[PDB]
Design a protein around this ligand. Structure first.
Ligand SMILES: [Zn+2]
Ligand SMILES: [Zn+2]
Lengths: 209, 147, 353, 117, 49, 49, 243
């Protein structure tokens, strides 16, 4: 019904506000914790024949260090999206001068659009999130250890201490649900901090390739 | 699929010396029974049981297109070890298949086409009982099945 | 037992048997008959093990674990019990009956393979055959599993064969690619470790502060467990008392880390050296009288573990990256080693000189 | 409802097929190899029992009473002729759902009465 | 002999009296080779004339 | 007095004829765990005599 | 996963020239009730009837509403299909079905209507998640499945709470549903943990599975040797079979 679709729009918004917080974008403490009724107050309950249309749910968050960088989280209203639809979004990113943005797809992306995202590496980057992949925050599962993306200064100092070439670390492929979560690009290195029952803690480094 | 869903369960025979499968009611008309009342008279020994009737029905609709004996033998001979150049080379070939290599313990000679009709209908009858579930599937290891 | 199986069987003929949720009526019947017959052979087994005299030789080989198990005594004296094929009670090889002797649709205990005779009284003809059907399943498994367990043993070796602990102590396969930063994440060979309890984990919050706290307020209890020079020393110095409140703060910080690493509160850990044995060995070698007050200064217990923990080095470096990677490798050991060597336990339980 | 059943043509003895009369709105059966038509008396066509609660008393044969390998009790007398011997057995049917119900078959010659308790 | 399928190997109720339950080789041949029971007499055949 | 079956149509000559030639030499075979009559079947064929 | 065949007693296809005919005895009552004010019949009513029965046992077991089934059938197939149903008052629970009214405004009908049935009985998906065959409910007596909370006194208190255990796995949708615990839910299947929770979750969920088969017998193998096998497999970045 429209109570379920109002509840779904409550998770998706909440879980995304945790992405933006974990990627280091400025997110107010009030936006992180929203009671459903407070959310139902702001965006008004039933989406269908109702005030939330799946648009105006868009999120603009600015990075902590750079106020200029920001990002968008777009919610398409269509079941599937196509190059003509993305070209609308990319025309909006051009309009407002940003670079990075997210897309939350209801069902799937047309096979012609997926390559269109890759078609722009440098100028604009876009990321496909299925509507389900955000229904739950996998960072909070018990199986997934704490991941930390590492600065370039720290990877140089790392590889000097253990005297490693970059390709001698373990890998985590860029198609990995915890790579997408942290918006990681090929060549960055991530720091897995997980508690162990022998050492009591252990720190693994994964390269992203 | 659209056809698989509508038909239900179809029965097929895999004969010796034939490349691929053949529908069943084609095999009874090949043996000289034109009507579907005679075909279903050998398979289903009591017509007052509709549960079997509904089991066979979708296998008549698959064989509906070939209504004649000599059309059916040609349907078989197309699939033989090698396709006959001339048609009547195939009908002569398929008839030699049903006479010899078909159930030879019943009989090898001529009018046995009737003797082969009941018993071959009895394979198709006993395959229904295990489809309806009125009998137990035979046991591979039951040592009365061994020689 | 065989009379309680006839009632369960009679209840199912009249349909009075109600299926357990998630179970076919055949699944609930095959369970209730197994619940009865197991209690039978579990009762007659324990009734036979009570009867054995102290001079019995079976009891001599079982009690010391030399050979045989308590379940072999049961089958010799008491009952051999149900015989199973593929985890199910004996099936129907004929049509609806197990052997030509039995009547069709006999689910009773005798027809389906329960052997009520013991190897000593000897098995009856059919029980001999069913017992042979349950033993064939043992011979077959032993012939089949060995060839699978040997094809897996060969695959695990060829994939791992070249992984080795390099002189950096980093574990690296044949290419130099890093499998682990330290072997096993603690960097310790597996043959010298033992089992141990943490003992800071899983007491109550009220008892924890009772065992590890070192209350100096009494001035009486301290005279009891500590020499006359030292208790006058501990009461006077405000600094000494400050250092001991710091140590107990580090035990709470570690008690909060343990409850993060060990949910379910399993306290049994594997660590390199046994502390409770070596504290126990240094009581006997030095002839310590635990009735007497100890001479060991409660600070030199604290300053001695801090100076110890620096001399246990898994990771060698001065870098802030090397420091952080040792505190993690020795984390759960320094936590354990500050539980047992705590300044209070040395004053009360151990009384080391 | 009924489990319905087949009908055969009277000329070529083929399977009649149900079809709709568009003018009179009356269900018909027509062989596809001739023009023979017949009006549908039953008005039901395809019926399928999924729950398939099945009456075994219809499948049971009275000859079963001659098998030595089946048990029998004099507890349950025959309902018709009042005969004491009754030879009882279970479904003996695959896909019976869950039934341990006993079916009874009366012994003594030619009675053959078959009941269930 | 290679096959790991255990159904052909297991001892079957139809082997009562016509095949020895205990006697059987071991190793890969377990249960595939079977001795005969004492009384058991294999039938030589005849004509059903 | 409690009738299991009143219909018995055949009686067996002796129950111990269900055992083959190599398992017929074991004394008291019903008193042994079942693999132990199978092993003797293997070691009864290897005996010097 | 509940297909409409789970709750269906029997099915029959009837030929009705007009609905008020009611070749069946009982339907005539409530049939007219809906046709006193008949709606969306404006085009015409297809003659071919599909009348299904619903066992009240399986209907009340899963807490299903006739209105709920009416919605999913009408929603699944759209307006090509019309659905009409009893109140619970009926001792025999019936759901009538007919071909599209506007279809009257190939495939024949009775053939096309039987093709709908054999598609419905399997494909309807009334409730639940396809590929989930069964789900068992029990209170675990093992301390691994028992929720264990630190009380206000710092003690460990093992709580008994109901847990579900499914036959068959689709992990991504199970986690998403309300009241299901996101954190502690887990499957034994690896590849569906790989594609959902990442390669790190496989590194842990593999050493939890290997430690289960090895220590189930009561035997004990050191944790060092488990963790190296799970390190060699997943250190390439993806699941590496040993093959
Ligand atoms: Zn006709
Ligand atoms: Zn009678």
């Amino acid at each position: 019904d429209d109570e379920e679709e109002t509840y779904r729009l409550w998770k998706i918004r909440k879980t995304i506000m945790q992405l933006c917080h974990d990627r280091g974008y400025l997110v107010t403490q009030d936006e992180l914790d929203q009671t459903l009724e407070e959310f139902k107050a702001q965006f008004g309950d039933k989406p269908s024949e109702g005030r939330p249309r799946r648009t105006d749910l868009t999120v603009l968050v600015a990075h902590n260090d750079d106020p200029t960088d920001q990002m968008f989280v777009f919610f398409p209203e269509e079941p599937k999206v196509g190059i003509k639809t993305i070209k609308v979004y990319c025309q909006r990113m051009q309009e407002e001068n940003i670079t990075r943005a997210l897309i939350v797809v209801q069902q799937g992306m047309t096979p012609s659009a997926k390559q269109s995202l890759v078609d722009m590496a440098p100028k604009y980057i876009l990321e496909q999130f299925l509507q389900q992949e955000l229904l739950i925050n996998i960072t909070e599962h018990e199986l997934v250890p704490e991941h930390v993306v590492m600065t370039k200064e720290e990877v140089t100092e790392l590889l000097a201490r253990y005297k490693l070439r970059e390709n001698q670390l373990p890998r985590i492929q860029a198609g990995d649900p915890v790579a997408r979560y942290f918006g990681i690009k090929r060549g960055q290195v991530v720091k897995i901090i997980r508690p162990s029952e022998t050492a009591g803690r252990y720190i693994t480094y994964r390269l992203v390739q | 699929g659209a056809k698989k869903s509508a038909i239900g369960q179809r029965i097929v025979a895999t004969l010796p010396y034939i490349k691929q499968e053949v529908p069943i009611i084609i095999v009874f008309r090949a043996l000289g029974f034109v009507s579907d009342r005679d075909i279903l008279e050998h398979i289903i020994y009591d017509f007052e049981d509709p549960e079997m009737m509904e089991m066979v029905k979708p296998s008549l609709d698959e064989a509906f297109v070939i209504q004649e004996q000599n059309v059916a033998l040609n349907f078989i001979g197309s699939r033989g070890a090698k396709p006959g150049v001339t048609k009547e080379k195939r009908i002569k070939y398929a008839k030699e298949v049903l006479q010899k290599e078909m159930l030879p313990h019943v009989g090898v000679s001529d009018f046995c086409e009737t003797k082969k009709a009941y018993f071959l209908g009895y394979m198709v009858h006993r395959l229904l009982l295990a489809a309806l579930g009125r009998r137990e599937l035979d046991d591979r290891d039951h040592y009365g099945n061994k020689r | 037992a065989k009379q309680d199986v006839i009632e369960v069987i009679e209840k199912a003929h009249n349909n009075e048997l109600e299926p357990t949720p998630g179970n076919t009526l055949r699944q609930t019947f095959e369970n209730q008959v197994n619940r009865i017959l197991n209690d039978a052979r579990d009762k007659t087994g324990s009734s036979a093990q009570k009867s054995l005299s102290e001079y019995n030789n079976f009891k001599s080989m079982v009690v010391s674990g030399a050979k045989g198990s308590k379940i072999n005594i049961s089958q010799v004296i008491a009952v051999v019990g149900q015989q199973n094929v593929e985890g199910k009670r004996i099936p129907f090889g004929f049509k609806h009956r197990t052997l030509p002797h039995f009547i069709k649709d006999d689910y009773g205990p005798e027809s389906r393979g329960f052997v009520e005779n013991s190897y000593l009284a000897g098995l009856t003809p059919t029980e001999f055959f069913f017992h042979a059907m349950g033993g064939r399943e043992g011979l077959i498994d032993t012939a089949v599993k060995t060839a699978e367990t040997g094809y897996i043993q060969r695959r695990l070796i060829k994939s791992m064969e070249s992984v080795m602990v390099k002189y950096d102590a980093t574990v690296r396969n044949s290419i130099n690619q890093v499998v682990q930063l330290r072997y096993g994440e603690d960097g310790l060979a597996g043959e010298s470790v033992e089992f141990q309890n943490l003992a800071t984990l899983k007491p109550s919050n009220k008892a924890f502060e009772k065992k590890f706290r070192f209350d100096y307020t009494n001035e009486r209890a301290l005279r009891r467990t500590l020499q006359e020079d030292l208790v006058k020393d501990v009461l006077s110095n405000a600094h000494i008392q400050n250092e001991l409140e710091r140590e107990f703060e580090r035990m709470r910080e570690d008690r909060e880390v343990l409850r993060v690493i060990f949910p379910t509160g399993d306290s049994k850990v594997v660590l390199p050296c046994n502390l409770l044995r070596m504290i126990w060995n240094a009581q006997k070698i030095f002839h310590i009288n635990p009735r007497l007050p100890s001479d060991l200064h409660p600070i030199k217990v604290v300053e001695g573990v801090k100076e110890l923990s620096k001399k246990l080095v898994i990771v060698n470096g001065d870098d802030p990256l090397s420091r952080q990677a040792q505190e993690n490798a020795t984390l759960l050991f320094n936590i354990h080693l500050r539980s047992t060597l705590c300044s209070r336990r040395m004053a009360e339980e151990f009384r080391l000189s | 409802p009924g489990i319905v059943g087949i009908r055969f043509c009277q000329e070529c003895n083929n399977m009649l097929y149900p079809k709709e009369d568009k003018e009179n709105r009356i269900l018909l059966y027509a062989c596809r190899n001739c023009d023979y038509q017949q009006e549908a008396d039953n008005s039901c066509i395809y019926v399928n029992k999924i729950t398939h609660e099945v009456d075994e008393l219809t499948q049971i044969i009275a000859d079963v009473s001659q098998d030595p390998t089946l048990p029998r009790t004099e507890d349950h007398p025959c309902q018709k002729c009042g005969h004491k011997e009754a030879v009882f057995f279970q479904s003996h049917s695959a896909r019976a759902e869950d039934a341990m119900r006993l079916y009874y078959v009366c012994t003594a010659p030619h009675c053959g009465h078959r009941w269930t308790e | 002999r290679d096959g790991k399928l255990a159904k052909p190997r297991q001892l079957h109720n139809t082997l009562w009296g016509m095949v020895c339950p205990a006697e059987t080789p071991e190793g890969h041949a377990v249960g595939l080779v079977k001795n005969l029971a004492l009384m058991a007499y294999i039938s030589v055949g005849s004509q059903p004339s | 007095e409690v009738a299991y079956c009143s219909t018995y149509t055949h009686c067996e000559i002796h129950p111990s004829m269900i055992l083959g030639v190599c398992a017929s030499i074991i004394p008291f075979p019903d008193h042994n765990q079942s693999p132990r009559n199978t092993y003797q079947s293997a070691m009864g064929k290897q005996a010097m005599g | 996963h509940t297909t409409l065949r789970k709750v269906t007693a029997n099915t029959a296809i009837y030929y009705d020239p007009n609905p008020q005919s009611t070749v069946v005895a009982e339907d005539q009552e409530w049939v007219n009730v809906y046709y006193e004010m008949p709606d969306f019949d404006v085009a015409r009513i297809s003659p071919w009837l599909l009348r299904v029965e619903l066992d009240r046992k399986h209907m009340t077991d899963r807490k299903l509403t006739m209105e709920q089934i009416a919605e999913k059938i009408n929603a699944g197939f759209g307006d090509d299909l019309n659905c009409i149903f009893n109140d619970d008052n009926a001792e025999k629970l019936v759901l009538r079905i007919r071909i599209m009214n506007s279809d009257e405004n190939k495939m024949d009908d009775d053939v096309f209507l039987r093709c709908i049935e054999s598609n419905m009985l399997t494909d309807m998906t009334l409730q639940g998640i396809e590929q989930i065959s069964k789900v068992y409910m029990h209170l675990p007596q093992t301390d691994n499945k028992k929720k264990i909370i630190i009380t206000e006194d710092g003690e460990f208190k093992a709580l008994q709470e109901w847990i579900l255990e499914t036959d068959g796995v689709s992990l991504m949708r199970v986690l998403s549903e309300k009241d299901v615990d996101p954190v502690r839910t887990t499957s034994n299947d690896i590849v569906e943990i790989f594609t959902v929770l990442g390669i790190e979750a496989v590194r842990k969920a593999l050493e939890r599975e290997l430690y289960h088969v090895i220590s189930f017998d009561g035997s004990y193998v050191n944790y060092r040797h488990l963790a190296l096998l799970c390190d060699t497999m997943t250190c390439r970045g993806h699941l590496m079979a040993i093959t």
